[PDB]
């Protein structure tokens, strides 16, 4: 814990084995700590290199042996006996013994870690600082502790790959968190058991019932992919059920030199022809408009709130037309290359420790946003718009280094992250709102006006729009003849099919897909052909996707609802905080899902009946 305790622990350490999540992170972290002085060496894996370099750890000169893994080193599965589909009843998979093993393609990495452990006295985990990263860290620990059981294990915590961050990580090494690793082991186990039991049950059943339609096809089940599909089917059904209605409104317009002024009815609209016809007839006879109230007040448009993973995933889809899976891929590439902070965070509050003034200064060399960044500094400095969430691990996603060398979508997302950051650190747009109320035969109509005085954050954030709506001068008490007095018709519009940002919003609202896993589950229902994208590009459910959701929902228990997964994901967060143990969560979640399974097997014919609506007869 203390500096004296650490220095004492480090005594007699000559070689320190360091392990990163991927080779590019290993090459990157080693290059920064060594100042490019690192010496490359070969591992037993051709894609996972060793970078030796001299470094000073807690007052001890050591040789840092920096290598990497390639994501998860260990695979989880049932024993060989339960692995074959025709070897057991899917119900036994809720209790069937599960084992962790190293795949053939990763054995070279496992053997490199083991090899280096022999020459090293300490182990430092440099995997990304998220739940999966801590679990990968514990996979590396288990492999090395098999060689040296008394090996000193430390954990480097960092939110960016920059010289200051990686140097501070070395001065503040901590203990690896078993709690967050355990939550990953619990989720991995539940996903395998619920996944396997329900997949084997429905795939085998539906392949026997509909052989011509679902031959050799995999009808997979996921505890999270199912309520995700549920949102898409729920919205489609909402549109299907929606009844549009004709409404009527009195439209009064008044012509001016360079623009027509439209006064909007204070009664807004009526769903009755005779009700509106009567009020309109009153308006044609004596249409003399009198200015009742000419009111004006200051109006403001708020600058964006500090950026988190969800807002990035949604805004990149809406504003840049990059899908969440690609956004997270590019965002991870920019993070690894040192241009942005860790893009997997729930934080929308800038920590007090973080120097925003430097981050803004750093962006002043840019031709496009440079002048604006300078403008923040000239106006006193950065004034961020913070939210209410903090994971207490990472800061909001922000630019950590300036680069002009990016291309394609990589440039587009970096530019977005920079502009959002500067907009957030800027001021709100300030305008003047004006309103003119007119009376025509005791009927009140209102025209609105806007005059933006200071655009502020809008000058760097083109993704948001604010436009002047300048109204002519109307004196309180004036009388005038309107250009036209009409009785126009309208109709109510149904909802639209969900976009990816719309689907992420629903997932967020209901607490599923937490820990930035939204994209993974949206991608699974896309890939399994349960949903399809329209040209618009919105989610349309397929016949199999549709049939499964209305099949399980007809069984009584509302299975398409995200309530059970949200409870599961909630329990996982408790394991991380040490607020709940892994054994109670496992026993409770397994009992809950085994019950839902047993009820579904009992009413299995409901699945056949729901899909028969699309594929016809079948036995």
């Amino acid at each position: 814990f203390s500096r004296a305790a650490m220095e004492m622990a480090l005594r007699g350490v000559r070689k320190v084995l360091c392990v990163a999540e991927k080779n590019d992170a290993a090459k990157g972290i080693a290059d920064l700590l060594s100042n490019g002085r690192m010496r490359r060496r070969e591992g037993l894996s051709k894609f996972n290199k060793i970078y030796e370099f001299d470094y000073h750890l807690y007052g001890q000169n050591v040789t840092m042996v920096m290598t990497s893994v390639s994501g998860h080193l260990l695979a989880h599965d049932f024993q060989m006996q339960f692995r074959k589909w025709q070897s057991c009843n899917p119900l036994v998979l809720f209790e069937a013994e599960i084992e962790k093993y190293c795949p053939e393609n990763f054995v070279d990495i496992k053997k490199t870690l083991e090899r280096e452990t022999r020459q090293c006295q300490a182990l430092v985990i440099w995997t990304d600082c998220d739940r999966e990263g801590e679990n990968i860290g514990f996979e590396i620990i288990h492999v090395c502790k098999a060689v040296k059981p008394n090996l000193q294990v430390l954990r480097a915590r960092f939110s960016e790959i920059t010289p200051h961050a990686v140097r501070t990580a070395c001065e503040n090494l901590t203990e690896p968190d078993q709690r967050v690793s355990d939550a990953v082991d619990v989720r991995q186990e539940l996903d395998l058991r619920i996944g396997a039991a329900f997949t084997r049950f429905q795939t085998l059943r539906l392949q026997r019932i509909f052989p011509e339609v679902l031959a050799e096809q995999l009808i997979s089940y996921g505890s999270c992919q199912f309520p995700t599909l549920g949102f898409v089917v729920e919205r489609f059904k909402a549109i299907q059920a929606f009844v549009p209605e004709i409404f009527h409104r009195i439209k009064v317009t008044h012509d001016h030199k360079d623009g027509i002024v439209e006064f909007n009815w204070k009664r807004h609209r009526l769903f009755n022809h005779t009700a509106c016809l009567v009020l309109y007839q009153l308006c044609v006879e004596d249409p003399m408009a009198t200015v009742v109230e000419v009111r004006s007040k200051p109006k403001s448009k708020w600058r964006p709130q500090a950026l988190d993973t969800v807002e990035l995933e949604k805004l990149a889809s809406r504003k840049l037309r990059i899908n969440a899976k690609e956004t997270m891929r590019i965002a991870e590439k920019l993070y690894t290359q040192g241009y942005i902070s860790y893009p997997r965070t729930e934080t929308n509050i800038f920590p007090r420790d973080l120097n925003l003034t430097v981050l803004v200064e750093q962006q002043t060399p840019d031709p496009r946003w440079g002048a604006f960044a300078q403008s923040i500094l000239e106006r006193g400095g950065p004034t961020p718009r913070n939210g209410n969430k903090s994971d207490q691990a990472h800061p909001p996603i922000h630019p950590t280094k300036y680069t002009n060398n990016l291309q394609g979508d990589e440039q587009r997302l970096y530019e977005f992250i920079v502009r959002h950051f500067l907009a957030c650190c800027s001021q709100d747009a300030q305008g003047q709102e004006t309103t003119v109320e007119i009376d025509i035969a005791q009927e009140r109509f209102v025209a609105h006006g806007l005059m933006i005085l200071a655009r502020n954050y809008l000058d760097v954030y083109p993704y948001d729009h604010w436009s002047d709506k300048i109204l002519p001068v109307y004196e309180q008490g004036s009388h005038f003849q309107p250009s036209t007095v009409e009785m126009v018709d309208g109709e109510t519009s149904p909802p639209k099919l969900l976009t990816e940002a719309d689907l992420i919003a629903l997932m967020e609202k209901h607490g599923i897909g937490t820990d930035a896993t939204h994209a993974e589950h949206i991608e699974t229902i896309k890939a399994r052909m349960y949903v399809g994208l329209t040209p618009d590009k919105r989610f349309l459910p397929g016949h199999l996707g549709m049939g499964l959701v209305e099949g399980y929902d007809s069984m009584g228990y509302e299975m398409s609802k995200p309530d059970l997964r949200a409870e599961l994901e909630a329990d996982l967060k408790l394991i991380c905080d040490g607020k709940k143990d892994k054994f109670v969560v496992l026993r409770q979640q397994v009992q809950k899902y085994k019950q839902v399974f047993i009820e579904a097997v009992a009413k299995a014919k409901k699945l056949d009946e729901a899909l028969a609506q699309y594929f016809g007869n079948g036995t």
């Binding site: 009664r267 807004h268 009526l270 949604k314 940002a501």
Partner: protein, 215 residues
């Protein structure tokens, strides 16, 4: 012979509530109230109350006693003056879509149906509202006209039972068989009609406006 009590009740009904009733119904009604309270000799005050309570529960369509002036539907526009104790057969809000209304009434949750990623475009207080407009189907039992909430009348609400008796008074401008009612022109007397509760229940009224079958 209850004709002496009938004149006294007729005087009171008109004086206190502007209720006009046919002599035959009134006499038949008094006789029934006398049979119901056989054990006692009721006062005129108690008789007047019980007669009025029976009136509130009576279907004006079955009363055959015209109240509203002749050809009120024949005149395109005009003004109506005087006191009328009419009956609401059905009632609906025309400021809100019937589909939106039936959904809320049916208690089904449509939260996820209005979820979008697009930023909250804060509406104006008459778009965030707008003020309610009830369209009443009023009758004297012979002629059927419409009553519009021209100005907010808070005593009226969509949940008023079909057959509810209401006093329509003062100067009221009317157009195309629609009365432009202001709060100062309406008074709710109460009551209900069993025969109407069935057919013109708010669920059934709205279901008809969205084309639901078997109605």
């Amino acid at each position: 012979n209850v004709t002496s009590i009938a004149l006294r009740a007729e005087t009171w009904l008109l004086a206190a509530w502007h209720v006009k009733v046919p002599p035959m119904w009134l006499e038949a009604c008094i006789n029934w109230i006398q049979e119901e309270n056989n054990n006692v000799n009721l006062s005129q005050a108690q008789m007047n109350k019980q007669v009025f309570e029976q009136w509130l529960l009576t279907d004006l369509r079955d009363l055959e006693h015209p109240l509203l002036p002749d050809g009120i539907l024949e005149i395109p526009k005009g003004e109506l003056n005087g006191f009328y104790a009419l009956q609401i057969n059905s009632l609906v809000d025309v400021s809100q879509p019937a589909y939106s209304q039936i959904q809320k009434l049916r208690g089904k949750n449509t939260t996820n149906d209005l979820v979008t990623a697009e930023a909250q475009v804060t509406p104006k207080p008459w778009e965030a509202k707008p003020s309610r407009m009830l369209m009443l189907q009023l009758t004297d039992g012979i002629v059927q006209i419409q009553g519009m909430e021209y100005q907010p009348i808070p005593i009226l609400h969509s949940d008023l039972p079909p057959g509810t008796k209401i006093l329509i008074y003062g100067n009221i401008s009317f157009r195309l068989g629609v009365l432009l009612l202001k709060p100062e022109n309406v008074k709710v007397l109460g009551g209900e009609v069993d025969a109407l509760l069935e057919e013109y229940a708010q669920e059934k009224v709205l279901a008809r406006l969205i084309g639901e079958p078997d109605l």
